[PDB]
Curated annotation (Swiss-Prot):
Present with 8890 molecules/cell in log phase SD medium. It is found in: Nucleus; Chromosome. Histone H3-H4 chaperone that plays a role in maintenance of chromatin structure during RNA polymerase II transcription elongation thereby repressing transcription initiation from cryptic promoters. Mediates the reassembly of nucleosomes onto the promoters of at least a selected set of genes during repression; the nucleosome reassembly is essential for transcriptional repression. Essential for viability. This is Transcription elongation factor SPT6. Residues 6-103 form the SH2 domain. The gene is SPT6. Belongs to the SPT6 family. Interacts with CTR9. It comes from the Eukaryota.
């Protein structure tokens, strides 16, 4: 389709992912959408085998092929692609890295992480434990799994990576630390 931007390709979801497979986390691609004249997608790599597709809705188009003068992502208004790449995408890549580097984050699949948490709990029978994992079935979400003690169920709450923090329940926390406190506070109540 008709768009002049270094990072634009006429790719579908699969071709985008193939193109990004071998590239760094945060590497992205803008591409046409199958939803019409007025949508684009940012595909990007969170990890090996893990890609998110962000819907870009265009408004105020001057003709069918041209890019829209107004762009909505995740209910936020933007003026051009560069603004989206920097103030939305790159902020998400920032927070992702912030989180995967935390002591509190466990890599790998959910099945694996649950194993890890349940062993730990058993060797720390009275310590409450909680870890973060990547949600491979819902790209851009983390699991938050905790276990009050060795005799409590393993509970799982969901946490959305946004461009301004980690959304949990009803609040968007701007850092991992703020998120950790916020979680310990949701429990006590």
């Amino acid at each position: 389709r008709v768009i002049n931007h270094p990072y634009y390709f006429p790719f579908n979801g699969r071709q985008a992912e193939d193109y990004l497979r071998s590239k760094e986390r945060g590497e992205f691609v803008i591409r046409q959408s199958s939803r019409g004249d007025d949508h684009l997608v940012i595909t990007w790599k969170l990890d090996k085998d893990l890609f998110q597709h962000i819907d870009i809705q265009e408004l105020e188009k001057e003709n069918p092929l041209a890019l829209g003068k107004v762009l909505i992502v995740d209910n936020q208004k933007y003026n051009d692609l560069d603004q989206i790449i920097v103030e939305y995408l790159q902020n998400k890549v920032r927070l992702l890295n912030e989180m995967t580097s935390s002591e509190k984050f466990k890599s790998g699949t959910k099945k694996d992480v649950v194993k890890f948490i349940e062993d730990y709990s058993r060797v720390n029978p009275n310590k409450s434990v909680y870890y973060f994992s990547l949600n491979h079935d819902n790209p851009g979400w983390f699991y938050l799994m905790f276990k009050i003690n060795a005799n409590s169920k393993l509970y799982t709450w969901n946490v959305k990576l946004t461009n301004t923090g980690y959304f949990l329940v009803n609040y968007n926390y701007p850092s991992v630390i703020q998120l950790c406190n916020g979680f310990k506070t949701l429990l006590k109540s």
